[PDB]
Homo-oligomer: A and B are copies of this chain.
Amino acid sequence: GTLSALAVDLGGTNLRVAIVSMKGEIVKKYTQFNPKTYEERINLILQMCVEAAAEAVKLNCRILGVGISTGGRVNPREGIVLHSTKLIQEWNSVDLRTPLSDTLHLPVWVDNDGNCAALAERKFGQGKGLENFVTLITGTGIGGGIIHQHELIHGSSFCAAELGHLVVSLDGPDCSCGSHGCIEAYASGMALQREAKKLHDEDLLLVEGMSAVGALHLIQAAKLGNAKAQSILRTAGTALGLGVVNILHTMNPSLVILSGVLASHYIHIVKDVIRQQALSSVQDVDVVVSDLVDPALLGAASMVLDYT
């Protein structure tokens, strides 16, 4: 059999389960909405993992374990989701290792989704071999992961690299975390979706050449000359850039990897903000867009593949 992992990724919108090969190929991926309650969510994770495990046999893949990427603060040693922002409701003090390992008879690893993104970039991506790098993954929310001396920083209370909650305003838009002025509150998918929905509500988004509203609509409108959309995207990208400047002046990594579909749209503004505002000693920092399709899911697999 192809040595493989089962990988789960639980984000602000979607719950995905995949069979991933030891080379980082996604063999098969199942996608559902992340349910809004604990009971539904745990049951769906189990269902999807059991079905994926059965298909793996039919696809001749030998599953070595299960890795779970999730939003929230996580204790990876104990496989417990400690605390989540409201992007995932009813997801506090949750033992994921026990129910999954009991159901599937497999070892189970769990980490925060940004930390998994970092692990993917270290194994399969542009972080391979590097002593220090940081990643920011834009999705519903913004996740972060920090590699220092080749290893993740988890922090004294497993809250390191909550990079979506870097604050770049004294005021600013409200964040789902309960704060305001967080980069996530400016630049996440959810933030852009809201701003697009607000413009579309006021008949102010659509422009000649387009016609369920989201971040990509705002970006399309901006390419097609919508002035309000361009301004929103500049503000968003500037905020993210300032988050990155904070990271540079804190950790001073050699490389920043931006991932998620919005990364390509933000990279130039992030580079410009660094150029215009960061200290000269961090100007040699490389800022790139990830070459991985799905860092969090790949990073969940990497925990199994490297540690089983």
* Smallest Cβ-Cβ distance to A160: which chain B residue: B252
- Which chain B positions have C-beta within 8 A of A165? 245, 249, 278-279
Q: Which of B156, B166, B251, B279 contacts A153 (CB 8 A)?
A: B251
Determine if A192 is an interface residue (Cβ-Cβ < 8 Å).
Answer: no
Q: By the criterion CB–CB under 8 Å, are A163 and B83 in contact?
A: no
Find the residue from A82, A154, A155, A156 having the highest chain B CB count within 10 A.
A156
Determine if A246 is an interface residue (Cβ-Cβ < 8 Å).
Answer: yes
- Which chain B positions have C-beta within 8 A of A163? 249-250
Determine if A179 is an interface residue (Cβ-Cβ < 8 Å).
Answer: yes
Per the bound structure, the CA–CA distance linking A86 and B249 in Å amounts to 17
Minimum CB–CB distance from A51 to chain B (whole Å) comes to 33
Determine if A132 is an interface residue (Cβ-Cβ < 8 Å).
Answer: yes
Per the bound structure, the CA–CA distance linking A132 and B238 in Å amounts to 31
Determine if A167 is an interface residue (Cβ-Cβ < 8 Å).
Answer: yes
Per the bound structure, the CA–CA distance linking A277 and B182 in Å amounts to 10
Determine if A29 is an interface residue (Cβ-Cβ < 8 Å).
Answer: no
Determine if A267 is an interface residue (Cβ-Cβ < 8 Å).
Answer: no
24 pairs of residues in contact across A and B, judged by CB atoms under 8 Å: A73-B279, A83-B280, A83-B281, A85-B279, A131-B156, A149-B149, A153-B251, A154-B252, A156-B254, A157-B285, A158-B281, A159-B249, A160-B251, A160-B252, A165-B245, A165-B279, A166-B249, A167-B168, A169-B169, A169-B170, A170-B239, A170-B242, A177-B279, A180-B277
Oligomeric state, in number of copies?
A: 2
Closest A-B pairs by Cβ, 4 of them: A155-B252, A159-B281, A160-B252, A156-B254
- Which chain B positions have C-beta within 8 A of A180? 277
With A131-B156, A153-B252, A165-B279 given, name 19 new contacts (CB 8 A).
A73-B279, A82-B281, A83-B279, A83-B280, A155-B251, A155-B252, A156-B253, A156-B285, A157-B254, A159-B249, A159-B282, A161-B249, A163-B249, A167-B242, A167-B246, A168-B181, A179-B278, A180-B277, A246-B246
- Which chain B positions have C-beta within 8 A of A242? 167, 170, 181
Minimum CB–CB distance from A282 to chain B (whole Å) comes to 5
Q: By the criterion CB–CB under 8 Å, are A250 and B247 in contact?
A: yes
Tell me the A142-199 residues at the B interface (CB within 8 Å). Answer: 146, 148-149, 153-163, 165-170, 172, 177-181
User: What is the number of residues of chain A that contact chain B, defined by CB distance less than 8 Å?
Assistant: 54
Given that A168-B168, A279-B159 are contacting pairs, would A148 and B148 also be in contact in the complex, using a CB cutoff of 8 Å?
Answer: yes
Q: By the criterion CB–CB under 8 Å, are A170 and B167 in contact?
A: no
- Which chain B positions have C-beta within 8 A of A32? none
Find the residue from A83, A161, A239, A249 having the highest chain B CB count within 10 A.
A249
Per the bound structure, the CA–CA distance linking A79 and B106 in Å amounts to 53
